[PDB]
């Protein structure tokens, strides 16, 4: 390469980014560095796309059947001691404010159910938004993910440059 071309007389001065190494200095003397800069790891950045509908569907089906069954059974109980019932249920679901003893307990339990389900939904949304896919794929040479040469994650140096020398000059 370039080092051999320089050693063969085909070159006299190299003005290019060249990492200083002991092996290179043993044959070609170097000058004062322009600036200090190490080597890092480059990984493509992906934007996650996962929106809470695909998270669960069984819970949605269960609540959708539960609202209807509790509404019809409580309306039957009230009649003992339809379109109007479903309209009232939808209105209460929208706003708890309305706009013998069975009505009070019905309102209390339905408001509690709405509060707990909305709290769970908000907590799940917040948790899944703060714990999404992270861009952190490596932290350094000591990162465990870098250690394993698994075929799933393929990574290698471009050529026989100073990275190869640094890898060869490691005890482990």
């Amino acid at each position: 390469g370039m080092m051999g071309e320089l050693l063969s007389g085909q070159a006299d001065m190299i003005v290019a980014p060249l990492t200083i190494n002991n092996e290179r200095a043993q044959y070609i003397e170097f000058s004062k560095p322009f600036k200090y800069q190490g080597l890092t790891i480059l990984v493509k950045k992906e934007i996650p796309r996962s929106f809470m509908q695909p998270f669960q569907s069984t819970l949605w089906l269960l609540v959708g059947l539960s609202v209807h069954v509790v509404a019809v059974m409580l309306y039957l109980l009230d009649r003992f001691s339809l379109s109007s019932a479903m309209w009232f249920s939808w209105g209460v679901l929208l706003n708890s404010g309305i706009g013998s003893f069975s009505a009070r307990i019905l309102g209390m339990v339905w408001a509690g159910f709405a509060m707990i389900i909305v709290a769970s939904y908000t907590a799940n949304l917040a948790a899944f938004l703060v714990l999404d896919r992270p861009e952190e794929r490596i932290t350094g040479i000591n990162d465990p993910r870098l250690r394993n040469p698994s075929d799933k994650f393929i990574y290698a140096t471009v050529k026989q440059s100073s990275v190869d020398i640094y890898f060869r000059r490691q005890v482990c």
């Binding site: 819970l59 539960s66 509790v70 059974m73 409580l74 109980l77 003992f80 001691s81 003893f101 069975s102 307990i105 339990v109 509690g112 159910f113 707990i116 389900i117 769970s120 799940n124």
Partner: peptide, 25 residues
Amino acid sequence: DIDNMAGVFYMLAAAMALSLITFIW
């Protein structure tokens, strides 16, 4: 979550108990 299912089903027992109480009374 399994914990959320148990938490939301805990109040169903109380609701049905209250419904039975107000039906029998």
